[PDB]
């Protein structure tokens, strides 16, 4: 019951999913052949959340994979746990977008999306009670940031009451791999605010910083960043698949973390994270988890959370632990940092406890906090956008496929209005 379907688009989203599904399968004891080989009874009670049942007793994820080029899905199939995905759900084009947002949203993405919407509708109509959808995509690419966001609007138009999740990677100015990143980032943020019920920003720069400083491993690769993102993704829905002292589905988090409908851009972080050589030194206790949870360097975004004030915060503890300690520590982390918490909403930290810890760990915490410090990312994105747009650089590529500069002006104005009205509440006082 109350299950969700998985939809991913683009190369970055496909690579994120290729590790997210591996993590989920390892958590539930599903072999790469789809056969259950788990140890505990609880591993099968709520498997309908992510997995479907077919004849022969094997399980198949309800994931939908889409891209405008076939290479990435032809590569993910040969990887481990690549056989679980149903071949029918693979939809792809023969041309690609070339990191051009217009091509992936107006000319090519519009004709292809009917086929993927057909299978999306097939998956949603069938399921017992829908909880919602979760979306993984990147804002630095053309086909992803175009087709995914148009699909968001199409899904929202047909299921207005369901919940919608988006895990979005925004292009940081530090590690830049594409010159046309500001254009399709700014165009995508315009559409994303209007339809997504929840959005979670993730930055490659913050992932590299975490890998270099906390884990202290010499050579980070995309596999480590994907593993961290996958652990963070799994931590959110853990209590929906396992029993606990205070169950809290996604809708309950939506109620408690979004004060106003347009303020739904969160930054997350996962604890504990320790190096291989120091994993024996540390002792896992609730104070040790909560001190690392609110650490500024532990956030999955380069945004500095002590440059603003938290509107609200959430924590999803895992493992068996006493609730009194959790509540007193949450109170203590809020009394010692009163300057960084907005004062006109008292008791702005939500907590939840799940009795099933991750495989290999005795305690774990997932942190989701809505803070005013996120304005800095939109500020720098808009700064680069307005630095590049004033000369109409690279504009002809977009304008040759039916798009105009008016949609750029409206997007810039709406993004600046969002930036302004997000900080409006930072200076608000009672």
């Amino acid at each position: 019951m109350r299950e969700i379907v998985h939809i991913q688009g683009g190369q970055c989203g496909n690579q994120i999913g290729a590790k997210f599904w591996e993590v989920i399968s390892d958590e539930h004891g599903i072999d790469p052949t789809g056969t259950y080989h788990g140890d505990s009874d609880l591993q099968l009670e709520r498997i309908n959340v992510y997995y479907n049942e077919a004849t022969g007793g094997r399980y198949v994820p309800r994931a939908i994979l889409m891209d405008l080029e076939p290479g990435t899905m032809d590569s993910v199939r040969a990887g481990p746990f690549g056989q679980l995905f149903r071949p029918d759900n693979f939809v792809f084009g023969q041309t690609g977008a070339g990191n051009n947002w217009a091509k992936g949203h107006y000319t090519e993405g519009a004709e292809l999306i009917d086929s993927v919407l057909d299978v999306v509708r097939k998956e949603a109509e069938g399921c017992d009670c829908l909880q919602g959808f979760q979306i993984t995509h990147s804002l630095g690419g053309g086909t992803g940031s175009g087709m995914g966001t148009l699909l968001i609007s199409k899904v929202r138009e047909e299921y207005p009451d369901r919940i919608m999740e988006t895990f979005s990677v925004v292009p940081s100015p530090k590690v830049s791999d594409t010159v046309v990143e500001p254009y399709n980032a700014t165009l995508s943020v315009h559409q994303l605010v209007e339809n997504a019920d929840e959005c979670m920003v993730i930055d490659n720069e913050a992932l590299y910083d975490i890998c270099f400083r906390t884990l202290k491993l010499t050579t980070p690769t995309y596999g480590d960043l994907n593993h961290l993102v996958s652990a963070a993704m799994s931590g959110v829905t853990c209590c929906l698949r396992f029993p606990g002292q205070l169950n809290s589905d996604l809708r309950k988090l939506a109620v408690n973390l979004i004060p106003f409908p347009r303020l739904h851009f969160f930054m997350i972080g996962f604890a504990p994270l320790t190096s291989r050589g120091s994993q024996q030194y540390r002792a896992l206790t609730v104070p040790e988890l909560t001190q690392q949870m609110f650490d500024a360097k532990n956030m999955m975004c380069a945004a500095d959370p002590r440059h603003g004030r938290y509107l609200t915060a959430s924590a999803l503890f895992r493992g068996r632990m006493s609730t009194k300690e959790v509540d007193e520590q949450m109170l203590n982390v809020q009394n010692k940092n009163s300057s960084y918490f907005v004062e006109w909403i008292p008791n702005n930290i939500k907590s939840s406890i799940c009795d099933i810890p991750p495989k290999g760990l005795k305690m774990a915490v997932t942190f989701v906090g809505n803070s005013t410090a996120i304005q800095e990312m939109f500020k720098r994105v808009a700064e680069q956008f307005t630095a590049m747009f004033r000369r109409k650089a690279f504009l002809h590529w977009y304008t040759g496929e039916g798009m105009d500069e008016m949609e750029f002006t409206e997007a810039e104005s709406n993004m600046n209005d969002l930036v302004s009205e997000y900080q409006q509440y930072q200076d608000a006082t009672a």
Binding site: M1, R2, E45, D128, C129, Q131, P243, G244, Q245, L246, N247, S248, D249, R251, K252, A254, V255, N256, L257, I258, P259, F260, P261, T312, M321, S322, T323, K324, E325, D327, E328, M330, L331, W344, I345, P346, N347, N348, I349, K350, S351, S352, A428, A430
Partner: protein, 430 residues
């Protein structure tokens, strides 16, 4: 020929119902399978040959807790189709569980209530348990109380609500639904007992000497209080008290029926037997402000009426000799228009111990239910918390979009202001 029906709604309600139903089964000698290997009739019913069925119903929209109940050791005890379960949780939204999803479930619950009531011949009244700071709990409790008040009329209903702590909180939006639920049960419930978690945490820490308590330890103390309250209906005693003999002794006026409880002694087996546990010392400990079961200071207000239950080998003359000492003390003062304020009950059955629990076995115990003027502080602080966020209309869109009107928030505020004025008007001397 005397019966009572207990209603459990929400996660906290079900988790305290489990706690009370181990204790009752243990106290009446019934095995977890329901089979005995004439006092049971108050809580149970005979099936003709063999097992006993509790006169209880479990309600929740979120299926995890009920599924946990239906697979534990008590799977054989409860009737399979009185554990009503939903599919979608209210997610801490009060408007959801009062207007959207609770209405489709409430009819089945009312049918079950009728089917249980037609069996009873001497129905004393109803008991209800619900944690107030949640969507489904508060909303469904309000709706059930409103339906029962008109279906049955003058039958007595008792509510063991758990209000949020002064500063410790798990959610961020619980003041809104707490205020709305207080509005709903102010004109619909005959007795309401205060049960916030912080006071019981302090009790456990100071007396039981547990530094890491969990919810089970709290629920066991609540279960012991319930057993002490209802012992007089199913055991022989020198001075009996019935449920219907409360509004004539503890409720001076129809509006004022919120009172706070205390229990004594609370002590572990490691140091219990070193001291004699006389009746005088336990009745002194019960009146200590630090042993209140709700985090309120009785020294800040007058007393109105005290109803306090004994059980064990206590002799009435020793009780009178201790009531005199309390009347003597200068730190405890009663209201002017109440010369005598004590109602005393004496029972012979000593409290029963649960194996593996915290409390030890003792021959004397005291449970007090006291109505005092100092309770207005919790209302004032909840009102202050509510006003801070209602000034800017925060989180209101999550309630307006679930069918509730805009003006519904204001009238709850007006009723709380009326209640606070009434409490001040009553406490002044003539």
């Amino acid at each position: 020929m005397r019966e009572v029906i207990s209603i459990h709604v929400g996660q906290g309600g079900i988790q305290v119902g489990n706690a009370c139903w181990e204790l009752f089964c243990l106290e009446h000698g019934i095995q977890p399978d329901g089979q005995m290997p004439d006092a049971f009739n108050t809580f149970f019913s005979e099936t003709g040959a063999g097992k006993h069925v509790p006169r209880a119903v479990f309600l929740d929209l979120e299926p995890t807790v009920i599924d946990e109940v239906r697979t534990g050791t008590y799977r054989q005890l409860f009737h399979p189709e009185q554990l009503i379960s939903g599919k979608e949780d209210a997610a801490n939204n009060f408007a959801r569980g009062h207007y959207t999803i609770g209405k489709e479930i409430v009819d089945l619950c009312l049918d079950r209530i009728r089917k249980l009531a037609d069996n009873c011949t001497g129905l004393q009244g109803f008991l209800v348990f619900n944690s107030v700071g949640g969507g489904t709990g508060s909303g469904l409790g309000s709706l059930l109380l409103e339906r029962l008040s008109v279906d049955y009329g003058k039958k007595s209903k008792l509510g063991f609500t758990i209000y949020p702590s002064p500063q410790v909180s798990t959610a961020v939006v619980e003041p809104y639904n707490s205020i709305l639920s207080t509005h709903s049960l102010l004109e619909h419930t005959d007795v309401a007992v205060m049960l916030d978690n912080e006071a019981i945490y302090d009790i456990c820490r100071r007396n039981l000497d547990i530094e890491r308590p969990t919810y089970t330890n709290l629920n066991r103390l609540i279960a012991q209080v319930i057993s002490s309250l209802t012992a007089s209906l199913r055991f022989d005693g020198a001075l009996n008290v019935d449920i219907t003999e409360f509004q004539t002794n503890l409720v001076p006026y129809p509006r004022i029926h919120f009172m706070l409880s205390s229990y004594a002694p609370i002590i572990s087996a490691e140091k219990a037997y070193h001291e004699q546990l006389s009746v005088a010392e336990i009745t002194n400990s019960a009146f200590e402000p630090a042993n209140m079961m709700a985090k309120c200071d009785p020294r800040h207000g007058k007393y109105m009426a005290c109803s306090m239950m004994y059980r064990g080998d206590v002799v009435p003359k020793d009780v009178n000799a201790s009531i005199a000492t309390i009347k003597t003390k200068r730190t405890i003062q009663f209201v002017d228009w109440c010369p005598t304020g004590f109602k005393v009950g004496i029972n012979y059955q000593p409290p029963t111990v649960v194996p593996g629990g915290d409390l030890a076995k003792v021959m004397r115990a005291v449970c007090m239910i006291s109505n005092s003027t100092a309770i207005a502080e919790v209302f004032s602080r909840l009102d202050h918390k509510f006003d801070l966020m209602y000034a800017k209309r925060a989180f209101v869109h999550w309630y307006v979009g679930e069918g509730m009107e805009e003006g519904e928030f204001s009238e709850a505020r007006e009723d709380l202001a009326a209640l606070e004025k009434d409490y001040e008007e009553v406490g002044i001397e003539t």
